[PDB]
Amino acid sequence: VKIGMAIDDLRLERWQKDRDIFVKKAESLGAKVFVQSANGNEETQMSQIENMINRGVDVLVIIPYNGQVLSNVVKEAKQEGIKVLAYDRMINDADIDFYISFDNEKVGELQAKALVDIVPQGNYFLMGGSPVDNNAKLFRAGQMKVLKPYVDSGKIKVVGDQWVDGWLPENALKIMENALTANNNKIDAVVASNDATAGGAIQALSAQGLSGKVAISGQDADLAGIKRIAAGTQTMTVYKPITLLANTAAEIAVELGNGQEPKADTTLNNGLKDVPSRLLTPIDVNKNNIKDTVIKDGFHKESEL
Incomplete structure (x- = not known):
């Protein structure tokens, strides 16, 4: 052939x-x-x-x-x-x-499920990718598929929802600050759609003393993302x-x-x-399996941590 x-x-x-x-x-x-x-x-x-x-x-x-x-x-x-x-x-x-x-829908599902796993009730902010990216919409479809029963039942309240133009971390940072301000920092989880936008949100969270306190999702298993996860400031990421x-x-x-x-x-x-x-099927990466996924695969080296 x-x-x-x-x-x-x-x-x-x-x-x-x-x-x-x-x-x-x-x-x-x-x-x-x-x-x-x-x-x-x-x-x-x-x-x-x-x-x-x-x-x-x-x-x-x-x-x-x-x-x-x-x-x-x-x-x-x-x-x-x-x-x-x-x-x-x-x-x-x-x-x-x-x-x-x-x-990609399963990517969105993994993101939202890791979040409802530790924050089953509370205030959620939805941080999409580029509003003109169809993949962004696929991630959001999978997220809402998981969230839907929590939202309809009143267990989870969506307190904001924005799409990050160009997937720019600096855009996500400003979106996060806006959200924190509008909610007087009362936000329990951020459904961010990748590691780069999550990183930017996390900077706004840090600046309010909220890092490690607010559950937040990601994707890609960027090195910086992997570290945050080890350090407790990011909840999880999705590895492909x-x-x-x-x-x-x-x-x-x-x-x-x-x-x-x-x-x-x-x-x-x-x-x-x-x-x-x-x-x-994409892979859920969190603090307890970083070595058995992304290190084991050679995606990242132990010495980089």
Whole structure:
């Protein structure tokens, strides 16, 4: 099986790990893998995807820089018998065959559940990600799925709700201060949607003497986040292991290559058809399993703590 992997931007860290694990596990299953990176350019990617079509690849694995502008090239690909897998980011209005990601709703669920676990009753503030990010909305859907019975029953009172423009920690800091002020510091838990915005909120909390006293959620397992968790100022974070994503992506790719039908958790609709999807299960990281998750994995080294 020949695989063409067209990564939107390798000039950063975000995908260099996905690439190697994917490769090694792909070859391991007996396939050739050709990789190109678009250096964050939409037109380099088009060029590259086309290059892979013209090389006679059996499977295209695309991480789209922009997944709205790929309908014609994907169609072109299907006309040649090539299978298309959307890696991590959905390709919209296109005739793709499969999509692999972490389950973002479950990310939101883990966030809210770790919080109701220690603060079952009290005042909650909701801190979304970018209000124009659909992932932000998926995290919020999972959060509210957990909170709903607590809210409807009066056990939890939502005292604020804001979306952090651009996921900027400085925006989150100002949102937190605003919230604390409007509530006279009476806030028991902050459902923050990532480690970076949580960090900013935590600075506002610290400045009021409230750090370690207010439950707060996160995501990504940033080093700074991991430390806060160890120190007691952050409650938890959500870890999304690259190995798991990249390995499963390779197994799906080979599968697609051998004309097989890989097992899907669900079906997401991209505005053309329903795309079979594996939405991996994200990992709850708290003070008691930091070593058995993010250290054990090599995501962070013990000596960094």
